[PDB]
Enzyme design. Structure first.
Site, PDB file in Angstrom:
ATOM      1  CG  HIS A 103     -13.074  -3.155  -1.585  1.00 67.51           C
ATOM      2  ND1 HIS A 103     -13.642  -2.223  -0.619  1.00 67.51           N
ATOM      3  CD2 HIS A 103     -11.927  -3.125  -1.628  1.00 67.51           C
ATOM      4  CE1 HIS A 103     -12.450  -1.386  -0.184  1.00 67.51           C
ATOM      5  NE2 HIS A 103     -11.455  -2.032  -1.016  1.00 67.51           N
ATOM      6  N   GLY A 125     -10.719   3.714   6.408  1.00 71.60           N
ATOM      7  CA  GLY A 125     -11.121   4.933   5.523  1.00 71.60           C
ATOM      8  C   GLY A 125     -10.190   5.444   4.481  1.00 71.60           C
ATOM      9  CB  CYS A 162     -10.016   1.531   0.682  1.00 69.60           C
ATOM     10  SG  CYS A 162      -9.721   0.269   1.645  1.00 69.60           S
TER      11      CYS A 162
END
Ligand code: XWH
Ligand code: CL
Ligand code: NA
Ligand code: NA
Lengths: 306, 306
Positions: free
Chosen positions: A41, A143, A145
């Site tokens: 993503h 932040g 991920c």
């Protein structure tokens, strides 16, 4: 003596954390051999996230659209592809710090260490369990991920989790390193919810054994029980069923402490039906379920990972 | 979202752990530049436990009496000296992995990460706090002496603890990296016992602020309190005095959440009076005191979940 929620030493994984930027989105990546792994993503804008077609979004990107920084050094992306929900960025240099590693998919109830990361820079390490409802009760901010979860078995790092999203209740969802989600979740901005969770019975038992080993014995009693009787109680109190294999796994601890599993189950039954009556166990007023039997054996024996 | 007891990533300290042997005793050393720091009690024998004269024991040692193993490699000891209760072994190799570092002596209530080690190799990482009675509630087995506690500010490791011994209550005592013990303890096996421990009030207040930041308000009330009335009540529950320093320290968290410090103090007074009545705060059924105000700000969002 003492018993603490303990993470694996994180050094081997820190040397694999990089920063990945695509457009206006920065998150973390895992750099092993000559591939950087990160959530697919990362290629989405906000409206893309509403209903993404990931193959279509990706074909518009060139290698130079992915900026990868290892420390203050940029990595050259030379290829890109998707595997399920993870993006694989081929780079021009192998990671000289690549540890011995495998990708493994864990089962609900098993624990792992999370290296929380921001901008490719490790910020903290903590221990998690994969819940029966396939979420984890992590601690993550925007932040984070691409942060990863791992165990160390002998000298091999077993990577088991990549962070993808936070659910509305504040718990967390992600994939294994092959990009398969844990749980019935999708990487899209749509309505999603954690299902009702249950307590990991075999882990609670392991932690009671840990308590006994550390001198905390007030909950022991003269009674024993049967699997079928106890599992009736577990179901009533939203505990996972105890299987024969769980009993076998707890075997060592039963012989060491002299408390058979079904003897300890009678302790747990009485605790579930009566509470703690003002007392604590290993400093806790709730029954702790994020220590596996292996966690307990290893912490109470000093296994190391150089 | 989420809130976890979170340690610093350990890698920078892992690359400093070595094994130190003297006679039949083996423990851990910390290798920084060309010096290895370890507990001086490594030079004690079985009859030296009660009243060792370390100056007399040390003068009898030559450099080759000390075996220092770093990974698979013997380091060569070219010098030794004692500073308070730590031994400093000068070796013929600077540690190529030496981080930016410094030595800091901490005050009760401060937190730090512990990298537990056996035979010079890291076993696990967890978070601790320096109790008001100058002990720490660690997880340490035989052979863990020489394990260290640390924080990492930016890229700089502040070493603040070295583990020396376990007291009869199962809690742990040790020194700063200048070899000065925390609290009244000595490296002798003579009877010594920790003072009655108390709860770290400023830390509980911090953690209640963390609960509000993460969206939980159930424990607040419409009341306030004077600082002195609060302390008069809290001491009856074995809580540490709250000072104006502590009130000042909590200013940032107060401003972020809109709850005055003394209003939060009123909430804590009520919690001590009432208990939680089957509810939890950040997943605990007890009030947590091993998160500092600095810890909460570092882990929590800067945006309160109203
Ligand atoms: F020598 C004994 F008696 F075997 C021993 C010593 C320890 C210990 C535990 C925690 N910290 C330091 C040392 N455990 N066991
Ligand atoms: Cl019976
Ligand atoms: Na029993
Ligand atoms: Na080592």
């Amino acid at each position: 003596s003492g018993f603490r929620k303990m993470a694996f030493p994180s050094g081997k994984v820190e040397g694999c954390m990089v920063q990945v930027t695509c457009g206006t989105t920065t998150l973390n990546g895992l750099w092993l051999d000559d591939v950087v792994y990160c959530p697919r993503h990362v290629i989405c804008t906000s409206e893309d996230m509403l209903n993404p077609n990931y193959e279509d979004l990706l074909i518009r990107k060139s290698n130079h659209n992915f900026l990868v920084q290892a420390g203050n050094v940029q990595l050259r992306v030379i290829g890109h592809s998707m595997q399920n929900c993870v993006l694989k960025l081929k780079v021009d240099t192998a990671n000289p710090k690549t540890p011995k590693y495998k990708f493994v998919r864990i089962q609900p109830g098993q624990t792992f260490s999370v290296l929380a990361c921001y901008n490719g820079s490790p910020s903290g390490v903590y221990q998690c369990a994969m819940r029966p409802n396939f979420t984890i009760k992590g601690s993550f901010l925007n932040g984070s991920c691409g942060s990863v979860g791992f165990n160390i078995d002998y000298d091999c790092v077993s990577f088991c989790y990549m962070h993808h999203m936070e659910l509305p209740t504040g718990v967390h969802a992600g994939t294994d390193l092959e990009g398969n989600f844990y749980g019935p979740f999708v990487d899209r901005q749509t309505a999603q919810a954690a299902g009702t969770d249950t307590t990991i019975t075999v882990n609670v038992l392991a932690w009671l054994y840990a308590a006994v080993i550390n001198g905390d014995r007030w909950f022991l009693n003269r009674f024993t029980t049967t699997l079928n009787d106890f599992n009736l109680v577990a179901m009533k109190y939203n505990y996972e069923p105890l299987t024969q294999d769980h009993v076998d796994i707890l075997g060592p601890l039963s012989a060491q402490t002299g408390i058979a599993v079904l003897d300890m189950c009678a302790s747990l039954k009485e605790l579930l039906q009566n509470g703690m009556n003002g007392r604590t166990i290993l400093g806790s007023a709730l029954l702790e379920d994020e220590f596996t039997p292996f966690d307990v054996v290893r912490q109470c024996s000093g296994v190391t990972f150089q």
